[PDB]
Amino acid sequence: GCCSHPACAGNNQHIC
């Protein structure tokens, strides 16, 4: 969902 977005994965390097 969000992780598929550059903005999400950006700060979700460890989150996602």
Side-chain angles (χ1 to χ4, degrees), residues 5-13:
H5 306 226
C8 221
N11 283 276
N12 284 243
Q13 283 138 130

Side-chain angles (χ1 to χ4, degrees), residues 2-16:
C2 182
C3 187
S4 307
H5 306 226
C8 221
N11 283 276
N12 284 243
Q13 283 138 130
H14 57 107
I15 318 190
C16 180

